[PDB]
Amino acid sequence: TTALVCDNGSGLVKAGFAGDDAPRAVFPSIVGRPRHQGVMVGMGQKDSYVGDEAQSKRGILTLKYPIEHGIITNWDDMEKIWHHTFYNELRVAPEEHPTLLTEAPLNPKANREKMTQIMFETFNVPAMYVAIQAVLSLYASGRTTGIVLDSGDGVTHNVPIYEGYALPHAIMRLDLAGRDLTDYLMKILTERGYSFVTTAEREIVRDIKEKLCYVALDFENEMATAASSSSLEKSYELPDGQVITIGNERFRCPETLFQPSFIGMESAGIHETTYNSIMKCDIDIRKDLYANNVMSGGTTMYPGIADRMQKEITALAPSTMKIKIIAPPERKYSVWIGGSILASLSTFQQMWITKQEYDEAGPSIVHRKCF
Amino acid sequence: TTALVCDNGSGLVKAGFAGDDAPRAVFPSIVGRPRHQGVMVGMGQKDSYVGDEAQSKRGILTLKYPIEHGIITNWDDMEKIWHHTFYNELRVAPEEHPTLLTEAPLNPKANREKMTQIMFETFNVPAMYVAIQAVLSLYASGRTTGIVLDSGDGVTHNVPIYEGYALPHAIMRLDLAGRDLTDYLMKILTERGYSFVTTAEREIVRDIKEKLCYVALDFENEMATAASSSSLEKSYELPDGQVITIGNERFRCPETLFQPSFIGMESAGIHETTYNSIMKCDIDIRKDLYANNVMSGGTTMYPGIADRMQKEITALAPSTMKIKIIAPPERKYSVWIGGSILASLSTFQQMWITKQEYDEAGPSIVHRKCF
Amino acid sequence: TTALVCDNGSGLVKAGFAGDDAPRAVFPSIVGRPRHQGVMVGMGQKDSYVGDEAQSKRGILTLKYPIEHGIITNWDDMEKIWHHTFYNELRVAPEEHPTLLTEAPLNPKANREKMTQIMFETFNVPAMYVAIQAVLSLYASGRTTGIVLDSGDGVTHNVPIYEGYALPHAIMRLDLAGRDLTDYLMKILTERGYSFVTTAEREIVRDIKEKLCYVALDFENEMATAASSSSLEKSYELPDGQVITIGNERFRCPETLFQPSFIGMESAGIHETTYNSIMKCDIDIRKDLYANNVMSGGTTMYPGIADRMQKEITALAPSTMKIKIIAPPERKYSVWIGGSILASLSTFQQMWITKQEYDEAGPSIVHRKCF
Ligand SMILES: Nc1ncnc2c1ncn2[C@@H]1O[C@H](COP(=O)(O)OP(=O)(O)O)[C@@H](O)[C@H]1O
Ligand SMILES: Nc1ncnc2c1ncn2[C@@H]1O[C@H](COP(=O)(O)OP(=O)(O)O)[C@@H](O)[C@H]1O
Ligand SMILES: Nc1ncnc2c1ncn2[C@@H]1O[C@H](COP(=O)(O)OP(=O)(O)O)[C@@H](O)[C@H]1O
Ligand SMILES: [Mg+2]
Ligand SMILES: [Mg+2]
Ligand SMILES: [Mg+2]
């Protein structure tokens, strides 16, 4: 039976069949419920819309993300989304196909406990597993060593690995990701006048960000150049033809990745986070982590991010050494690609949590058998 | 049993059977009484006349409209109109038939309350319903989405709808319609000495308005042209042989719809009201309302009005949009046709207010079981 | 030289001198112009009227508000109102006095840019300063640690301030204020038949609101009480001579504050906004923010709103905390009184913006020498 690799990301749900090389389907993880009053008798049915249907019709809906910082907060929505992805997207019976999920490190235990409980008692999947995301990212690159910086929609996390051996005492999780960047872009935009408030309008600010934002290579220089002239301005068209124009916002918003004091946070930037992640590990493996940075996750698709991080980390690490910022072209999907790779292995097929094992031991097994 | 549709307008009662595509009865909504002595013997009885039997004898009658501005102001006579419709036009005792009525939006509660009270207590219909006029207008075109502009005889109101979900904060009503324009035409006809002072002469002026008037496409150019030439003047023959000739009145009277300050009202024209109603809707759907602007009501029957709405909304709205005014050729009965379609839904048979329910809860039930 | 303090309200301009106890002059911020034509020579002159004189004659004027939601939309008329204050109400040439102004938070930048440019180029004030309204609101009360819930005529906003160190990432600004409550009241007064359809009658609805609206401590309970008994029905006398009776509108009108979905808005009520603004702050400072909720703004004078806010917030904050609301009688002028306090301090004299500094650096200096 061909396994399934369901990466229940925090912003987008990626899914597909093991043995493939790209997800069968992608779509946002939003459950929309109508907000106004229905007058047309015999029309306006389907009290709730999920996925792309609620994405397009968002004018009359309220968009709820069930995942808030990588931690599933509302469960009824999550069950809804899993049923949707299994049936109306993949179009297969879950009770015959192994599944492989993904989770962030340092998550509350009840999260994955209930994840497995749902998978086994609602969908009756024959087998399932819960892998960490950076390990799959490091498979997707095809490596055994490296330090993985996977920044999704909810969470940012470093996870140094060396020759297959993870070093949990240096894993660092920094809860600052794409969603916060959009919520700060929305707030800065008012300086020009534009007011984006409703839940739906976050999905227009998100597109503005995805379309126009780029991380600076020298923040001070970019501010100076922007102030000098309008060379950096770019105009965007709302869904009402009205055109908006943003200048230095384009690189002020991503800057928050490196100076979380923009959003008020105390944590340090991602460059210092990765550096301090390297320093905590054993001194004799630092050489192969300094030289094997491997990015992942969507948030790392801003132009100029790689050069900026190269410069910023090299301004920290000892000069004689070499820092190499590997950025796979499809890093937006590395976790799922690695999941497919893992589910392909013959050696791995002895590590499944089978329905008999779950029935014998109970939900708590998923902690023992899973990293 | 078969239901009845009774679109009790302010100018014309349109009553018939659900299923047909036309009203079975169409008579004016007036109730006349004699203002002269009755020296004849055994002749001139029936102190009051109703409908066309009143119109044909308007020589010796005083005409009254039981409905004014869409709020019923004389129930003793609206009862006579209902009695006439049921018993002489459709020729059916209502006690057997479900009855479907209509009321304009923002129209006081104590109006439909007393309408329900009358229908249940006096005629004793098995069940009934009060559907808003814009919504039926929207069914008649079979659409799902658009901004409905009804311009009846006494009220002009908009009701934006997207995918079936109405927006109560964008329902803008403008009580300027056919009777205001009839009175204004009577006012400006005095410039040429034509003095129409009574009610019968108001009916004659209403026929003048229907027969001659048309909406200008550029008011200042039309005024200059008419003032500089006789290309526009037209004639009409009164019911005693005298012949009248009118000029720029023809397009001055309709223009009041786009400039109510012609009659002292401060509100905005119909174009501005439509734009404001759309612009109170969510940004997500304005692209779909711009291209689905419906029309209805008798007063929008002027030749070239659709072109003027096109021009005004095109000038007002953002340049990157497709304005398209939907003007069905049969749009004089659009509300009634929509009602006929609505009453013939199997899903709508659960929406009727049944006699037992009103006996239980009372007139206020209409505020619950009806829009 | 006594430095004025000109609080720029959206609905009421509050002006006076620094050091006083309360404003020397108060007058509404509207600019009116007649719509009809003059017929008698030497009468009905001076096409434009401003403020209270426009209020007095509003029967023949069209009334425009230069400010919308706190953002000066009509500069040509705000200039006239500033001229009016300086040269008729206070009756002092401004170029002899430092002039302290105010501005709401999260307010677009070009707004205060031009607000400074006009002040320095038309009136040529020797100095000036543009404070925030929450900081002044907290000055007036003499505290140092509070979260001001300032509800005005254009903007409702919270601002947590602790020991004088603001938290710029927690400030919230909602575009719901007195004017929307007035508009919703004017709409729901059509449920009874009263039609208020002119810019002149917006002020009659405004006074009906100010004089008969009150907030319910338990919305559903008050609705039941109103339906069951007429004890909540009170009558009012319109200037035209008529009389009106209003039942449950009296509290249905201010309820838009706590369930903004009544006016089609999605955002959360004021109590939820305050709770969120307190939950976005550091952990250890919430204890003192809970205990110093300082109210302000005219919209907050609705009887029963302090109690309502305290009752509602105590259901969100953990039971162990001592939620307090401070509702001084003079909370309407709080911002101006705070400005009067600020201008008199001896430590403030250095942070003025002087004519020479503006000349050397232009309007951009406002973002640098203020908050
Ligand atoms: N081309 C892009 N440029 C910038 N940001 C992007 C791009 N694509 C996706 N993102 C960001 O990535 C987030 C969603 O994608 P993703 O990182 O993969 O979430 P997740 O892994 O949890 O499924 C969004 O916050 C979005 O801002
Ligand atoms: N061809 C026409 N041209 C101009 N005005 C018209 C035309 N037909 C009807 N009207 C006007 O519309 C009014 C009646 O239209 P109607 O839709 O039936 O009003 P109601 O809301 O009561 O149903 C009349 O007063 C008449 O003046
Ligand atoms: N006692 C009151 N009760 C209720 N509303 C009031 C009261 N006083 C003023 N208002 C309303 O608040 C607004 C004026 O108050 P204000 O705080 O000064 O607005 P702004 O800050 O913009 O100057 C007006 O819309 C008015 O209707
Ligand atoms: Mg991810
Ligand atoms: Mg009509
Ligand atoms: Mg204020």
Author numbering:
A (entry chain C), B (entry chain A), C (entry chain B): 5 to 375
Copy text verbatim from the article accompanying this structure deposition:
ATP-hydrolysis-coupled actin polymerization is a fundamental mechanism of cellular force generation. Actin polymerization powers fundamental cellular processes, including cell migration, organelle dynamics and endocytosis. After incorporation into F-actin, subunits rapidly hydrolyse bound ATP in seconds. F-actin polymerization is coupled to the G-to-F transition, a substantial flattening of the actin subunit that renders its nucleotide cleft active site competent for hydrolysis.
Reasoning that continuous conformational flexibility was limiting the resolution of the 16-protomer reconstruction, we focused on the central 7 subunits. Focused refinement substantially improved the resolution of both bent F-actin reconstructions (ADP–F-actin, 3.6 Å; ADP-Pi–F-actin, 3.7 Å), facilitating direct atomic model building and refinement. To examine the internal deformations of individual subunits, we superimposed each protomer with a subunit from its nucleotide-state-matched helically symmetric model and examined subdomain-averaged Cα displacements. This revealed complex displacement patterns that were dependent on a protomer’s strand membership and lattice position, primarily characterized by subunit shearing around the nucleotide cleft. Although subdomain displacement patterns were highly similar between ADP and ADP-Pi, the shearing magnitude was greater in ADP, consistent with the higher overall average curvature of bent ADP segments and enhanced deformability of ADP subunits. To identify specific structural elements experiencing deformations, we once again performed per-residue strain pseudoenergy analysis, which is insensitive to rigid-body displacements. This revealed three primary sites of strain: the H-plug (Extended Data Fig. 8a (left)), the D-loop (Extended Data Fig. 8a (right)) and the nucleotide cleft. Notably, bent ADP–F-actin displayed significantly higher total strain in residues adjacent to the nucleotide (7.5 Å distance cut-off) compared with bent ADP-Pi–F-actin or the straight ADP–F-actin controls. Consistently, solvent-accessible volume measurements also revealed expanded nucleotide clefts in the bent ADP–F-actin protomers relative to bent ADP-Pi–F-actin and straight ADP–F-actin controls. We also examined detailed rearrangements within the subunits (Supplementary Discussion and Supplementary Videos 5 and 6). These were broadly consistent with actin’s nucleotide cleft functioning as a deformable locus that coordinates mechanical rearrangements, the rigidity of which is dependent on phosphate occupancy.
